[PDB]
Amino acid sequence: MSLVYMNIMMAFTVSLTGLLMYRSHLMSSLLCLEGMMLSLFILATLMILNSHFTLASMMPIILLVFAACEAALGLSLLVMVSNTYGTDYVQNLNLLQC
Amino acid sequence: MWFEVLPGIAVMGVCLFIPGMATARIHRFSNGGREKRVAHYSYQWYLMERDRRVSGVNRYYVSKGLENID
Amino acid sequence: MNPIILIIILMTVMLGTIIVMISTHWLLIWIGFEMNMLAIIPIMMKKHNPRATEASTKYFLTQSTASMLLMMAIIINLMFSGQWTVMKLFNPMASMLMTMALAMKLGMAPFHFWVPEVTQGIPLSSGLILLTWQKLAPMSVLYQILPSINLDLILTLSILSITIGGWGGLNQTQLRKIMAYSSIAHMGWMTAVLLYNPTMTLLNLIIYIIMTSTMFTLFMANSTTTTLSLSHTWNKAPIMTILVLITLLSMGGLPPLSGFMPKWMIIQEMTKNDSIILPTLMAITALLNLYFYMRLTYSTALTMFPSTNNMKMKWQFPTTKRMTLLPTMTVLSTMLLPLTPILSILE
Amino acid sequence: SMMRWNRERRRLQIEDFEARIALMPLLQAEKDRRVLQMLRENLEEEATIMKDVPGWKVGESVFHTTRWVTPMMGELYGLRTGEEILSSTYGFIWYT
Amino acid sequence: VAAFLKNVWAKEPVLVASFAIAGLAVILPTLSPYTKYSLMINRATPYNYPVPLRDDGNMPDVPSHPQDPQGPSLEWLKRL
Amino acid sequence: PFFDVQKKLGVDLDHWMTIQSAEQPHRIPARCHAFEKEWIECAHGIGSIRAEKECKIEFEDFRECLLRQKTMKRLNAIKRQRDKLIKEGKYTPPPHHSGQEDLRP
Amino acid sequence: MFMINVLTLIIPILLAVAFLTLVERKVLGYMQFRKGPNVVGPYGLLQPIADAIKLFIKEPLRPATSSISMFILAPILALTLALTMWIPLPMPYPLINMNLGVLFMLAMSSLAVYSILWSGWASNSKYALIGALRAVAQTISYEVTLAIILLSVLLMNGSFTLSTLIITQEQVWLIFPAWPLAMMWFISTLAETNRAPFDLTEGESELVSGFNVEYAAGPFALFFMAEYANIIMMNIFTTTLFLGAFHNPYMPELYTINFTIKSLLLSITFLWIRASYPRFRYDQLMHLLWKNFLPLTLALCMWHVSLPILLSSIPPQT
Amino acid sequence: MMTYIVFILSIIFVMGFVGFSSKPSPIYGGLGLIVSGGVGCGIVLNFGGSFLGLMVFLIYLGGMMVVFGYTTAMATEQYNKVVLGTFITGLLMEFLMVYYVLKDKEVEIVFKFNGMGDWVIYDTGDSGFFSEEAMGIAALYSYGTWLVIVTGWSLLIGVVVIMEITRGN
Amino acid sequence: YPTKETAHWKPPPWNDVDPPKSNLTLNFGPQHPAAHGVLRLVMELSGEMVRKCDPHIGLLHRGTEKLIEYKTYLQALPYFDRLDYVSMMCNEQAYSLAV
Amino acid sequence: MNLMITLLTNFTLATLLVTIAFWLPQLNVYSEKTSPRLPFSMKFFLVAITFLLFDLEIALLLPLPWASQTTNLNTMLTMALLLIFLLAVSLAYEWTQKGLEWTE
Numbered sequence A: 001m002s003l004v005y006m007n008i009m010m011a012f013t014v015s016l017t018g019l020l021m022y023r024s025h026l027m028s029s030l031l032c033l034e035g036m037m038l039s040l041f042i043l044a045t046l047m048i049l050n051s052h053f054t055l056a057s058m059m060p061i062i063l064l065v066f067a068a069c070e071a072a073l074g075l076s077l078l079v080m081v082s083n084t085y086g087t088d089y090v091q092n093l094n095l096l097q098c
Numbered sequence B: 001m002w003f004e005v006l007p008g009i010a011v012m013g014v015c016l017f018i019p020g021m022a023t024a025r026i027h028r029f030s031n032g033g034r035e036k037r038v039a040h041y042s043y044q045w046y047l048m049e050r051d052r053r054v055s056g057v058n059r060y061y062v063s064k065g066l067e068n069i070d
Numbered sequence C: 001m002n003p004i005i006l007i008i009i010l011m012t013v014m015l016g017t018i019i020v021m022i023s024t025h026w027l028l029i030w031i032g033f034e035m036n037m038l039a040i041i042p043i044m045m046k047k048h049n050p051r052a053t054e055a056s057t058k059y060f061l062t063q064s065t066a067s068m069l070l071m072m073a074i075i076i077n078l079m080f081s082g083q084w085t086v087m088k089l090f091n092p093m094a095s096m097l098m099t100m101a102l103a104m105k106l107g108m109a110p111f112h113f114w115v116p117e118v119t120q121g122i123p124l125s126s127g128l129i130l131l132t133w134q135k136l137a138p139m140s141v142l143y144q145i146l147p148s149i150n151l152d153l154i155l156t157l158s159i160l161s162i163t164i165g166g167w168g169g170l171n172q173t174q175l176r177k178i179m180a181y182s183s184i185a186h187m188g189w190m191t192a193v194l195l196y197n198p199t200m201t202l203l204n205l206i207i208y209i210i211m212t213s214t215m216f217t218l219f220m221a222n223s224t225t226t227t228l229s230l231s232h233t234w235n236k237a238p239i240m241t242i243l244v245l246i247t248l249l250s251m252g253g254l255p256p257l258s259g260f261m262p263k264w265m266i267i268q269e270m271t272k273n274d275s276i277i278l279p280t281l282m283a284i285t286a287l288l289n290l291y292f293y294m295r296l297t298y299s300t301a302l303t304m305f306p307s308t309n310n311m312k313m314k315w316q317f318p319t320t321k322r323m324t325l326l327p328t329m330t331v332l333s334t335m336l337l338p339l340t341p342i343l344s345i346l347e
Numbered sequence D: 001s002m003m004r005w006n007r008e009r010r011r012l013q014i015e016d017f018e019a020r021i022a023l024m025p026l027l028q029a030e031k032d033r034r035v036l037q038m039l040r041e042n043l044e045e046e047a048t049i050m051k052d053v054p055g056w057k058v059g060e061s062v063f064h065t066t067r068w069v070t071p072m073m074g075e076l077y078g079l080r081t082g083e084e085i086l087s088s089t090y091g092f093i094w095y096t
Numbered sequence E: 001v002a003a004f005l006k007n008v009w010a011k012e013p014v015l016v017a018s019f020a021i022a023g024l025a026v027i028l029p030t031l032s033p034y035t036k037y038s039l040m041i042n043r044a045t046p047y048n049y050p051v052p053l054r055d056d057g058n059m060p061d062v063p064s065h066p067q068d069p070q071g072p073s074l075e076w077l078k079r080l
Numbered sequence F: 001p002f003f004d005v006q007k008k009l010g011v012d013l014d015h016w017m018t019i020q021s022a023e024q025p026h027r028i029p030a031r032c033h034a035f036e037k038e039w040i041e042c043a044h045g046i047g048s049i050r051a052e053k054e055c056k057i058e059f060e061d062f063r064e065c066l067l068r069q070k071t072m073k074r075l076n077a078i079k080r081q082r083d084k085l086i087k088e089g090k091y092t093p094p095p096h097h098s099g100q101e102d103l104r105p
Numbered sequence G: 001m002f003m004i005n006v007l008t009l010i011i012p013i014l015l016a017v018a019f020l021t022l023v024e025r026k027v028l029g030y031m032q033f034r035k036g037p038n039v040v041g042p043y044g045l046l047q048p049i050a051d052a053i054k055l056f057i058k059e060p061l062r063p064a065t066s067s068i069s070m071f072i073l074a075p076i077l078a079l080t081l082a083l084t085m086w087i088p089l090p091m092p093y094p095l096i097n098m099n100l101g102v103l104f105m106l107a108m109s110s111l112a113v114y115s116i117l118w119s120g121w122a123s124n125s126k127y128a129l130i131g132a133l134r135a136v137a138q139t140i141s142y143e144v145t146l147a148i149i150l151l152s153v154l155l156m157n158g159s160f161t162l163s164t165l166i167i168t169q170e171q172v173w174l175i176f177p178a179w180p181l182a183m184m185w186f187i188s189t190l191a192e193t194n195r196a197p198f199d200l201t202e203g204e205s206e207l208v209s210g211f212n213v214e215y216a217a218g219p220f221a222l223f224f225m226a227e228y229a230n231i232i233m234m235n236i237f238t239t240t241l242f243l244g245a246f247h248n249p250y251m252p253e254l255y256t257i258n259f260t261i262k263s264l265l266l267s268i269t270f271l272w273i274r275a276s277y278p279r280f281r282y283d284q285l286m287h288l289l290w291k292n293f294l295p296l297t298l299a300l301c302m303w304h305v306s307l308p309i310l311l312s313s314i315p316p317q318t
Numbered sequence H: 001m002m003t004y005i006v007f008i009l010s011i012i013f014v015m016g017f018v019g020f021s022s023k024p025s026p027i028y029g030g031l032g033l034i035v036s037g038g039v040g041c042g043i044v045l046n047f048g049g050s051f052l053g054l055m056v057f058l059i060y061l062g063g064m065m066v067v068f069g070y071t072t073a074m075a076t077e078q079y080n081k082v083v084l085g086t087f088i089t090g091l092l093m094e095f096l097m098v099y100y101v102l103k104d105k106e107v108e109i110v111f112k113f114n115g116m117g118d119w120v121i122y123d124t125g126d127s128g129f130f131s132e133e134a135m136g137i138a139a140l141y142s143y144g145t146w147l148v149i150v151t152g153w154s155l156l157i158g159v160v161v162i163m164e165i166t167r168g169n
Numbered sequence I: 001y002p003t004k005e006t007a008h009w010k011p012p013p014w015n016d017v018d019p020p021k022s023n024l025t026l027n028f029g030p031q032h033p034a035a036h037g038v039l040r041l042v043m044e045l046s047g048e049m050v051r052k053c054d055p056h057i058g059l060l061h062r063g064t065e066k067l068i069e070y071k072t073y074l075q076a077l078p079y080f081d082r083l084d085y086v087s088m089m090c091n092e093q094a095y096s097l098a099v
Numbered sequence J: 001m002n003l004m005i006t007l008l009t010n011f012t013l014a015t016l017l018v019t020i021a022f023w024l025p026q027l028n029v030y031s032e033k034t035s036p037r038l039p040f041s042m043k044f045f046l047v048a049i050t051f052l053l054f055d056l057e058i059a060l061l062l063p064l065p066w067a068s069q070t071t072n073l074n075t076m077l078t079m080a081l082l083l084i085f086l087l088a089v090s091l092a093y094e095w096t097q098k099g100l101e102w103t104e
């Protein structure tokens, strides 16, 4: 198929493995999540513009709005974690092991 | 008095006058003494590319009228 | 929380589940999961302690990852089909990604690793919502995509969910983690029969929701979050020990109870399709679930653990808790096996 | 004032659109002859190139139907120069 | 309804102007005589091509030419 | 649990964005409108199991309309053979594939 | 030939920014019963040249930075955005005649707060970062009313095209149907550029602007000239947007002189507002946005949605 | 080179995702995602999605990454091996993919992909006096009634949800 | 079942509430030091609010009223012009009335 | 392509002026100068999230000048006034539960 679709899929998998392998921060996890969303936006837009399928032109707007509201919810969770512990480190969020 | 600010306002006004007058004269120079063809929609680009093909000299702004038909 | 805000947020959770159930467009499916997650996050943070914030953060991360994989599966479906109908998928890669995403939304193993922690970190009513109501939307999407679901993938997820939900609860003394590992095992049981007969999937889902709602309603009525606090029920409310006895003997699949009905109908439909080894391994693995159920019954009803002196003050006070549908949910989770051919209404 | 002027602007838009509509049959005829010219030239150059390849069907449809399929950008501007390619494939997008 | 309105126009005139402008925006197209003409102008704007019809023999209301009398006219748009 | 509330109440919530052959704004046709219409009118009413085998040709034409993989593979073969004949010197490009012919309309 | 057009755009931008400093000091001089510069050049005309040569050889300030690369990129991004906000401006013809020039300018001005945020990250002060956060919150606050006022005005335009906005105002200035949007727009563009009475970084009501404080900052001249490019640009955009002039297609210089005179009067109006009022407290302009402008902006947004439908005055798309 | 402009922008997009996905810091992670959003927006702009590209700039980079940097300025304190090693690993993998698909004109990692430029797959038609993408986005109001209902309800619930969970009581 | 690995696991609290496990102090100065210029303030800020404001003075303490002790009355008069240096003849008049 | 040339020229002029302003004051060799977590505010984060949520509501409002051109004007006017009303109700709930406090 289209050569640019390979790169946008590989970008989604790169941001996936970034999100699927944490280093320290929850903010970097949310950045990898929104990079995944960015690659989803670009790939959906390239398909819908390529197809000349008219009514799905409003679909990437809905994706962007819903997932940025999702991102605001994630930043509020990060803010409550940082208000609890002082950092946004993922190793401070291990009380639920026992 | 208050008119002592008018040289600086005049220099600033000439500096604002240069870009628009410059792009108007460049659009008239680059397009056969006329305005630049505004192609916001694909029909306007379709007609513009048709003009580029029918002029023969690979220029959209070379207009062929009734002298071109028999 | 403001009760007006609580009512609107619970209506928004229900509305997201309804939008997943009734819509014919993949973007509306994704919208419904986004609405469901976005509304259920304050239900988890109702008490505002660090464990609820940790549980809500882990739940957000897992459901967000699942939602993005779901949208990627939808996007590959739009590649290879040019359309949006919620039906079978037109690519096995999109089928694998959507099966992984719905397994993450269910908390099936190996994506089960959030369910005991997130269930432990949140209150019992929100844990009830997470372990009963949130199972309805991804099982509906799995119900509509089953012509495209890979057999080996969903059966691997099912047997791994049954085995891990069996060996998980054997070490646990927290009641919410026991209910979470029971959730993992029962979601394995539900998806194991999905490609064979999804009416038995709906039967297992309904009977499991009734039994889980019974157990969480008993835990809310007794205000017990540990095994050892559930043990002090005999000196306070002795009927509740009988109810947790019959409900935990139900959830272990013992006849003549109604929790025998789902796994018996699942073995009944999988051996129609010439699978003998797989439901036998499933049935032998369910003995671990029944083992920690029997551990709970021994600690609560069949013995009497020693109590403290302050229970004498609570003898003088009755329960003012609105135990909504607890007798109805107790009767329907124990004495429904004579009505086993009622499953045809789900066809 | 904006009521009078936007009603006049809508009348002027309908005048421009009906000029477009009156010109569309001629442009459709020229575009039909354009794409058939380019496909016939691509077919002739395929006939003079794809001889050494064994089992090649010149002008073979990649579709199983015999319905006319709208030509793709590579199906028209594929064997041509890259300047013509760019002017047909990013001309309107890059235009000013 | 009279003393409260004067009190809130004294205290918070910004919000009174806001709810007044918003309320007129809501209820005024239902009382406007020109709302029909917006619909009529938007459906009379020819973005596409008026694809002709095969004259089977009996279509008296469809013209044979743009300048024919029968057909949807725009005298109301020129005149108003 | 596909509770088909839209067909029960008769309301249309999301059937319009569902396919490319639906009623588009200003009657804009999609690039695979005919192929998707043929595949849908083939596969309608006969179910998925009969639609995977009895509507395979319309589905293949519609997939090859969407992705254009056979077309790009054919153009790869033609361009590769053309570049090989340029490399072997046994071929010269025509004046209408060089930019020296003043195009049709 | 097109590069000549790009240079005749972007070099007179820098010259107009240089002499806006002189016009500011002179007009604030005479409005304060004094004079501005008149010694350095004839009538002070060599003041900006002298001041730019002074600032370009003055020592890098005292300290070092937290992030070096963002300390480099914040003036680069500020100057790049301040020069690329001009390219769709129709005067009477834009440089890049794009179909969505309004939305392009709103998007590139939404990108402008990263220079503030990266200059806050770059300085080693934990207090200058707080001041940068306050300025970022101020700017993204007033971007809301920028977007909604701009949308409400373009409901009478028909498109996002800036060149169509000259065609729209051929019968009347668009300040006459939309003067409340115009006055809230003018104050909101005044609050975008951190301009008085809303300049809290360059004034008091600030935790870090405090006499023997830390925070290595960049070359002040580059942020200063990006800021004045933004000021002149937003005044030309307001002139195009509300006070759009007469355009003869055969004589473009009439429209060019006309929008130039209106843009000069509107930039002098910025200079005349900053020399007339005390500064807001930070919560007072947060109040001014969220409890004064945004209710009226939403009310007028509903009004300018429903008004072309009830007047049958819907503008055309093309 | 100019015919492959969308491919070059896509390679810069993948390089940017490798840049921040290796996660040097949330600050430089945000910077890398900003540059990635810009080049992916350029990818979208070069097919004719002008409104959707300006939605990237205005909404994604203009609001959301501004809020991510705003929150990162309130989380971390200002002043490796795994980051740089994973960066050069992803760069080697991506340039090996580029070299393979440029020397072979067909590659199969998960799906088959063409080696020519993506200019071939466009349409040879015109839309008239409108952008089709603009009209399909304008149809959010007339056709997309239920979509606007659920999106506005989700945003109002999002406001209520953020005010509930950040209150701390 | 405790192991060698899961030996450090204490059981969770009863109400699932853990113990939570400050305010800004600012040294202040006037922005442009032309009007006051010699003011020092130690703040205790609480975000926006001010909890404690401690002015530190003596930065223009010159020991005027010890220098007066070694000078005559006519010599002590010009020290009063320099106390409130926008109120010169008022302080002159006050010292004049005292003498 | 004209846009990319213009952006490249603007970025090059910006980088050139930054290179001047970082290397030109190093020509005059000066002396070697030898002598020698932030408090989190909930209100700053809340005004940032309030911006982000209302900016998403603006992102819904942005196709209105094109949506006025439709033929389903009753539906379009209803959904337009409904989106601006939901933005107003979002602002009202942000008001009355003391969300807009001390950054009002």
Ligand SMILES: CCCCCCCCCCCCCCCCCC(=O)OC[C@H](COP(=O)([O-])OCC[N+](C)(C)C)OC(=O)CCCCCCCCCCCCCCCCC
Pocket (backbone or CB within 6 Å): E011, E012, E014, E016, E017, E020, E021, E024, G175, G180, G182, G183, G184, G186, G187, G197, G238, G242, G273, G277, G288, G291, G292, G293, G296
């Ligand atoms: C574009 C060209 C220029 C445009 C004009 C701008 C040039 C003039 C600039 C003057 C200097 C301003 C310097 C900055 C000042 C900042 C402070 C300020 O003004 O705050 C704004 C003040 C703020 O209010 P306030 O602070 O004065 O009041 C106190 C408010 N409370 C009680 C909440 C504390 O006012 C506004 O917000 C008004 C904004 C514009 C109002 C538009 C009115 C439209 C009315 C239509 C009719 C309504 C009647 C009812 C409906 C009838 C329907 C038929």
Ligand SMILES: CCCCCCCCCCCCCCCCCC(=O)OC[C@H](COP(=O)(O)OCCN)OC(=O)CCCCCCCCCCCCCCCCC
Pocket (backbone or CB within 6 Å): B011, B014, B015, G015, G041, G042, G045, G046, G049
């Ligand atoms: C769009 C338009 C933009 C315009 C931008 C610029 C605006 C201002 C234009 C210039 C205004 C007038 C400048 C006059 C400066 C003073 C000249 C002068 O008298 O300098 C005297 C000085 C010493 O001379 P000395 O020989 O000692 O004299 C004693 C004789 N008994 O001798 C000297 O200092 C040496 C000579 C210096 C001459 C400097 C002239 C001004 C240079 C400004 C730079 C930009 C100029 C414009 C460029 C574009 C247009 C050409």
Ligand SMILES: CCCCCCCCCCCCCCCCCC(=O)OC[C@H](COP(=O)(O)OCCN)OC(=O)CCCCCCCCCCCCCCCCC
Pocket (backbone or CB within 6 Å): C010, C125, C128, C129, C132, C133, C136, C202, C206, C209, C210, C213, C217, C220, C322, C323, C324, C325, C329, F001
């Ligand atoms: C194909 C299937 C389609 C779908 C079919 C139906 C599926 C049903 C799924 C049931 C999910 C139940 C989720 C929990 C109940 C919902 C309402 C709720 O949130 O109730 C909790 C509420 C909160 O009160 P609060 O004050 O917060 O309590 C904590 C102490 N202060 O109040 C309390 O905490 C009070 C304590 C008792 C609450 C008991 C609630 C039981 C609800 C479930 C009933 C059984 C399901 C219906 C019958 C079977 C249907 C299949």
Ligand SMILES: CCCCCCCCCCCCCCCCCC(=O)OC[C@H](COP(=O)(O)OCCN)OC(=O)CCCCCCCCCCCCCCCCC
Pocket (backbone or CB within 6 Å): E008, E012, E015, E016, E017, E018, E019, E020, E022, E023, E024, E026, G294, G295, G296, G298, G299, J085, J088, J089, J091, J092, J095
């Ligand atoms: C119906 C059409 C659609 C209507 C919805 C669309 C509205 C568009 C404008 C958006 C406004 C968004 C924010 C609205 C918040 C309203 C609530 C409010 O602000 O209440 C608090 C306020 C007192 O404020 P306080 O608590 O003291 O705070 C310090 C400020 N000084 O309390 C007050 O100031 C009292 C405010 C209520 C009384 C106002 C009465 C106005 C009547 C105008 C004439 C009739 C117009 C017809 C429609 C009426 C609708 C109510």
Ligand SMILES: CCCCCCCCCCCCCCCCCC(=O)OC[C@H](COP(=O)(O)OCCN)OC(=O)CCCCCCCCCCCCCCCCC
Pocket (backbone or CB within 6 Å): B039, B040, B041, D092, D093, D094, D095, D096, G073, G076, G077, G080, G081, G084, G097, G098, G099, G100, G101, G104, H034, H035, H037, H038, H039, H041, H042, H043, H045, H046, H050, H051, H053, J001, J003, J004, J007, J011
């Ligand atoms: C820290 C990093 C560095 C920071 C400093 C530098 C970056 C920030 C400042 C520059 C921002 C660059 C923005 C580039 C795109 C702008 C949007 C755009 O292209 O809009 C114009 C136009 C859309 O309008 P329309 O008229 O519909 O299209 C033509 C149809 N006849 O569309 C067109 O005309 C399309 C023209 C072709 C496509 C142009 C694509 C440019 C290349 C990709 C982006 C490069 C910049 C990457 C970084 C961005 C910011 C992070």
